[PDB]
Every structure is written in structure tokens, then in C-alpha cells.
Design a protein around this ligand. Structure first.
Ligand SMILES: [Ca+2]
Ligand SMILES: [Ca+2]
Ligand SMILES: [Ca+2]
Ligand SMILES: [Ca+2]
Ligand SMILES: [Ca+2]
Ligand SMILES: [Ca+2]
Ligand code: NA
Ligand code: NA
Ligand code: NA
Ligand code: NA
Ligand code: NA
Ligand code: NA
Ligand code: NA
Ligand code: NA
Ligand code: NA
Ligand code: NA
Ligand code: NA
Ligand code: NA
Lengths: 10, 393, 390, 10
């Protein structure tokens, strides 16, 4: 269950 | 100096109290903060509540027999005004009790002391105006994507970006990102700022202008925008203020793709119904799988041990066949947030975000859509960007 | 020798499946016990749900392509059939799986060994029957008073007393007692028995009969009525059995007063509305108070520190004035059970039960100071008061 | 909160 590639955040 | 005595129809009284209750649904630890403040003067009644984070106030016409103010239990006043019949309501403060009479029923409530009852925040200067319904809808849309976990405070807010001609609203919980852009009437043409506002009851606050043409956003003007640390929202005798979050929002704009290797358009109502149907055999409600190809997508869920389900749906598809899986709740959340008849999906790989957008009539067609792609993204005022989950293989 | 294959409209399928699956165990001892049994033969589909306590079996018309039986998860079948479009549903058993197809949707579910499914109990011989609307009303009126605490199993039952054409139904939770007497069509004129039936289940059956055919109650005939320890309920192509409670019920009849020191008649709808209003300030006290005298009653609740409420209501009163208090929920439960425009209250003291009975709007039940005899009635709701403050 | 005088039961 990957996260959105928010940087930072993921 | 004088005791408050007023008189007004129940529906109006009840609607004003309801505005406060909906904007302050929880019960604070400090008892006096559960009070509602009633203030009568001239020909008007104001009804307000405050808990240091959100204030909410409604103003209604009323027969003011004697001016004054009183603090009374918000819970009781809400219960009572909701239950009463549609008759005139008499309210008379006498000593440390308030008499509330409606038809044959008489209530006598204890007053609360105003000694330590906080003064309501002042509305900042008007920043701009939006159409009432549009704004209430826009907040409702993006709020579904906000985080609800205080261990990650930055995700519990709705980002509000002010830019002269437009307002951009964004929310994310790391799994979906919702972004809405609206045009508005700004007081200042050269204004530029961004704040972060607690999302939890912002959808209720956003309904302030309902009943009128516009809703007013108050964050201050010119250079000092966000300075007061509050967002005011008002219209039509209703207002609220919400304390801003002093937390940093993720940089989300880099995530919005400008092209896709596959694009799929289909019916929102059909897809929502099919997801709900096949997900009945998904364990933990973990995953639904979509196999897109020319003309059709196979939606499926389940495993050989509990049961399997699938349904074929018509799709207007472009690109190469793609299998991609989603959290069905996150997916139907996105579909429901579109508020449109049809959805366009923009895909790259099975492991990268999917871009959901509403299909409109004034959308300019994708040139070379029948060809190979990559296909340029179509301009839209709303996006719901959804991360897929990994397929079992 | 052959695998089951059938076809029928979703709505017919969903309604039968739902009714049968609902009484399946919460924590099934073995996977088999979570299943519903589908059996197709000739022109009909039988759907069976076994549970130690309550077993249920629905029969519906169906296109039987190939006869047979299959055991599938009850809850999943129910959920799926509830959610499908209103199209024909195809069901086809192949080996260890069952395919369910409806329009463009296809399901493939695991099956369980039908040989391991317990046999549903046989229904007892028919004891009598009554109209569905009468069954629904009588059970609804009495069930509201039944206890919901399994530490006192006897109170969780509805007592059912049969004597020929007459049926008496009773329930209590120690604070209210509801008693309904009715007439029905008895199998035998000299039938006579008394049993105790789990209320929750019976109430569900009575509600589900609404709009339906006459309801048949099966406890047996003659002297052997009750001996099987089962109550059968049937109608509408649906039949169920409920295991009876094997517990002694309190002797309730001696509680019904035959005379009153005061009697009061009021409008039911208006009193229910007024109670709802004054009870808004009674969350802590859990009581409303009534001060009766000639012509009027003061209904009130609350306290200085939390808030007070009062309403005066018209009353046709006779006898000694009385101040008495009640749990407002128990009081509006009783008022809601009367199914009449008006209510008669029969009182003695503030610490003794109040007898509520139904009064029509065309009736007016007086001379003297009292006491006044109790008026014969087919329904009573006997409610204990609570202690007044101070 | 007294009970109905049920015997037994109270
Ligand atoms: Ca509150
Ligand atoms: Ca094509
Ligand atoms: Ca192509
Ligand atoms: Ca696009
Ligand atoms: Ca855009
Ligand atoms: Ca009688
Ligand atoms: Na109003
Ligand atoms: Na105020
Ligand atoms: Na409007
Ligand atoms: Na559909
Ligand atoms: Na889910
Ligand atoms: Na196409
Ligand atoms: Na299920
Ligand atoms: Na199996
Ligand atoms: Na039943
Ligand atoms: Na039964
Ligand atoms: Na209440
Ligand atoms: Na009586």
C-alpha cells in the first residue's frame, strides 16, 4: 500500500 | 443593566441555534464553553458559540421586548428548539434563570456566568467573495481527501491558496490528493497567500452563504493576509471563524501529471455500483482490480478461498491494456467527489498515481487520442489523484 | 446424482435468502454452520437455515434446470443478492463451487459439504391460526415489555397461554407488564397449554408477517401441545421453528388491580408529545412527574441545576388527587402500545403500579369519590412508578 | 426505582 510520492510524506 | 426578553418564531430560532451546533458539534472540556450566548438589541437577536478554535454566530430578526444578553446551555437549547412545534417562542431572563415558553410548554433554564466566557473573535477584513453554492460544494469535494489523524497535523487541514483571480483548495491523506480551483471576486487584485485550515468541520462552515448569492472569505487584505491566524467565512446573517493550522503542507503540484500513457472515460454511477458489488468478496475491503482494454474494463475482487467476483463495464479507452488495483473505498470516494456524470482516468504504470477528473461539455478533445500517446492531460478545475495498491503478484 | 442449476428473478431470491440467513449463528462452531442450504426440485427452490435455537426455511417458485442441493455462505449470499440488479439470477453448481451470474456480473463462491449440514427440526402439529395483522399488533404490543437481559432468561420470553379459542400473551421486565388477550382459530376446541417463547425472535416473525397470509402457530394438538419444546410459525411459503424457553414465568395475574382510588383519561397523542418535550431536561433524573387533580394534570421534569420543564394537560379525572412519577421511556412505550385515541390510567398510590388501558375517542368512562372498579379490557400495560424526589 | 410486585421477581 504505497503512498503518493509527496515530498515529504510519501 | 436590563434583562433580555424576546420573542420569535420557532423555525428561525431553531435554524440559528442549528448553525452554531453544526459548526461546534463536539463538547469541550471547559463547561462554560458549552454555553450559547444570546444577545438581543433593537430588532435583532444574535446567537453565538466559541471554543477558542472555532466561533460561530447567527443573526436573526426578532421582537426585542427588552435588550440584553444571557448565556445558556447550548446542548439544552439545541434539543429544545429542535423539538418544539412551529409556534412563537417567548424568552425571558429573570435573575439567574431564563424562561422559555412555546405554546403550552414552559422551560426554566439556569443561566451560566459570563465572567470567564471568552469574547468572540473579530472577523478579519474581507479577502474576497465566491458564489455560495460553489464554495460549499468545493469544500465538500476536497475534504474527503483530508487526513483525520492528529499525529500528522499537516494532513488534517485544507490548503487554501489565494491568488487574485483564483482560489485553490487542496487536501491529502498520503493516499489521495484532491485539488479544486475556483474563480472569485477578490477585494485586492495583487493579493497572494496560502493558509492551512482545519478540515474537520470546514464543510459546515462553508455553507454560510447558502440562501444568498455569495459567501465572504475573510483572511485580511494586502500584505497582512493570514496575520490574524483566522479564516472568517460569512454570508446571509451567518458567520464563523476557524483558527488556522500553523503546519507545513506537502508540495503537491509536482505530483499532477501533464500527460498519460493511457486514458479511460466511463460512467460514474455504473462504476460506483459495480465497485460496491464486487467488493462484497474482498477481504478487509482491501482491493479491487481493474483490467482496462479497448472497449471494456473488467472489475474484479476476491480470492478462491472466500469467493471471487467480476463485472465488465463499457469504457472509452486509449492506450495499451493496463491492470491496476485500488482501495475500493478511496476509489468510490474519488468518484463521488467528481459530482459529474462521467469520469476520465489518466494512467501511467500500475504502481503510479491515477488522475481522476470530471468530464465536462466544454472540454477540448485530446488530439491523437486514437493514436499511441502519451496523451496530454486535459485542463480541469478539479482533480482527485489516487495512489493504486500493489497487485498480489 | 446431479448438480443444481436454477434461475429466478433477483427480488424473489433476495427476499427468501435474507429471511432464511438472518437467524444463522454469530460464531458458527464449524464453517458448515454459517451456510444456507439451497435445494431445487421440480418447479421450486427451498432455502434452509439451521441454528440450534431458530431454524428457518423459505420456499419460492424457480426455474429448475437441474435438481440438486448446495451449501453456501449465508451472509455472503444475502449481501450479494441484495445488491444485484433486478435481473434474472443464474445459479450453477460445478464441483466445489457455485457460479452466480446476473447480467454482466459473475460470482464464484466456495461450497460446503451438504452431508454435514444438520437436519432442520420438523414443525409440530398445527395448534391454531390468526390473521397476520392481529399477530403483528398483539406481538408488537407485548414484546415492548419483555426483558432484554439474558441473566434473567424467564423475562426474555413472551408467555403464551392457550385455552381453546382464546390466547393470552404476556411479557415483563420487572418494571412494566404487558398483557394481550385475543381470539384465534384453534385446531381443537379443547386445546390448552402454556409456553414461553423467546421474545426477540417472535417479534421479528410478527413484523415479517405484515401484509401477509394468515399465520399458523404449531405447538402440537390435544395434550401433547408444548411437549416438543418447539414453536412453529408458518405462512407465505416460509416456516420456522423456535426452541421454547424451559423456564418458570412469574404469576402475573395477581398484579392486575380490580379497583382504583383514581382514574384518569387523556389524549394519547398529546400526552406522548408532551412527555417528549418535558423529558428533554430529565436525562439525569430519568423521570417525569404528574400532579393529577380535577380537570388537569401538571406534567413536569428536571431540577434547578439542570433545567426544568412543565406542561398542563386536560384530564377527565375522578377520585383522589395524586402525585406520581414515571420513567418517561417506559411511559411512552405503554402509551404507544395502546393503539387507541385515548388512554385510561387506573391508580392507587404513588408507590404502586398504574394500569394503562386503551380507550376509544367515542367512549367516556363517573360519580362519587371512589373507589372505581377496573373496566374489562383486552389489553393492559401495567407500569411501576418511580420514587419522587425529596 | 422499585419493581412491580411480581412473585418472584419484584
Ligand atoms: Ca459543541
Ligand atoms: Ca474506439
Ligand atoms: Ca490507439
Ligand atoms: Ca485528461
Ligand atoms: Ca487546472
Ligand atoms: Ca381482560
Ligand atoms: Na433564521
Ligand atoms: Na455573540
Ligand atoms: Na442556493
Ligand atoms: Na448500473
Ligand atoms: Na476499503
Ligand atoms: Na475509444
Ligand atoms: Na458477505
Ligand atoms: Na469447500
Ligand atoms: Na421465525
Ligand atoms: Na418459529
Ligand atoms: Na434527552
Ligand atoms: Na382499569
Amino acid at each position: 500500500v504505497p503512498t503518493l510520492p509527496l515530498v515529504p510524506x510519501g | 443593566l436590563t434583562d433580555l426578553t424576546f420573542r420569535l418564531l420557532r423555525e428561525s430560532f431553531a435554524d440559528a441555534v442549528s448553525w452554531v451546533a453544526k459548526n461546534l458539534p463536539a463538547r469541550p472540556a471547559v463547561p462554560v464553553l458549552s454555553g450559547v450566548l444570546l444577545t438581543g438589541s433593537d430588532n435583532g437577536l444574535t446567537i453565538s458559540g466559541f471554543d477558542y478554535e472555532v466561533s460561530a454566530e447567527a443573526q436573526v430578526g426578532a421582537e426585542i421586548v427588552s435588550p440584553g444578553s444571557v448565556l445558556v446551555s447550548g446542548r439544552l437549547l439545541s434539543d429544545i428548539t429542535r423539538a418544539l412545534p412551529n409556534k412563537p417562542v417567548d424568552v425571558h431572563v429573570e435573575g439567574n434563570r431564563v424562561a422559555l415558553t412555546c405554546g403550552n410548554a414552559r422551560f426554566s433554564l439556569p443561566t451560566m456566568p459570563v465572567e470567564d466566557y471568552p469574547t468572540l473573535p473579530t472577523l478579519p477584513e474581507e479577502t474576497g467573495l465566491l458564489p455560495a453554492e460553489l464554495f460549499a460544494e468545493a469544500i465538500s469535494q476536497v475534504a474527503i481527501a483530508a487526513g483525520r489523524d492528529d499525529t500528522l497535523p499537516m494532513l488534517t487541514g485544507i490548503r487554501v491558496e489565494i491568488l487574485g483571480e483564483t482560489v485553490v483548495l487542496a487536501a491529502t491523506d498520503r493516499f489521495r490528493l484532491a485539488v479544486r480551483e475556483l474563480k472569485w471576486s477578490a477585494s485586492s487584485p495583487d493579493i497572494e497567500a496560502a493558509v492551512l485550515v482545519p478540515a474537520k468541520t470546514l464543510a459546515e462552515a462553508a455553507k454560510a452563504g447558502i440562501g444568498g448569492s455569495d459567501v465572504r472569505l475573510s483572511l485580511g487584505t494586502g500584505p497582512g493576509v493570514g496575520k490574524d491566524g483566522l479564516l472568517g467565512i460569512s454570508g446571509n446573517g451567518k458567520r464563523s471563524t476557524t483558527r488556522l493550522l500553523d503546519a507545513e503542507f506537502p508540495k503537491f503540484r509536482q505530483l499532477l501529471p501533464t500527460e498519460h500513457t493511457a486514458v479511460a472515460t466511463m460512467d460514474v454511477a455504473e462504476l460506483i455500483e459495480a465497485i460496491k458489488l464486487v467488493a462484497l468478496v474482498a477481504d478487509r475491503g482491501a482491493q479491487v482490480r481493474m483490467e482496462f482494454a479497448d472497449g471494456s474494463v473488467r472489475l474484479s475482487a476476491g480470492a478462491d478461498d472466500v469467493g471471487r467476483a467480476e463485472e465488465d463495464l463499457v469504457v472509452d479507452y486509449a492506450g495499451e491494456p493496463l491492470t491496476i488495483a485500488f482501495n475500493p473505498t478511496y476509489l468510490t470516494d474519488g468518484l463521488s467527489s467528481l459530482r459529474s456524470e462521467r469520469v476520465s482516468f489518466g494512467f501511467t504504470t500500475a504502481g503510479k498515481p491515477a488522475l481522476l477528473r470530471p468530464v465536462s461539455g466544454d472540454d477540448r478533445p485530446v488530439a491523437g487520442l486514437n493514436g499511441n500517446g502519451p496523451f496530454p492531460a486535459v485542463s480541469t478545475d478539479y482533480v482527485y489523484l489516487l495512489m493504486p495498491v500493489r497487485l498480489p503478484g
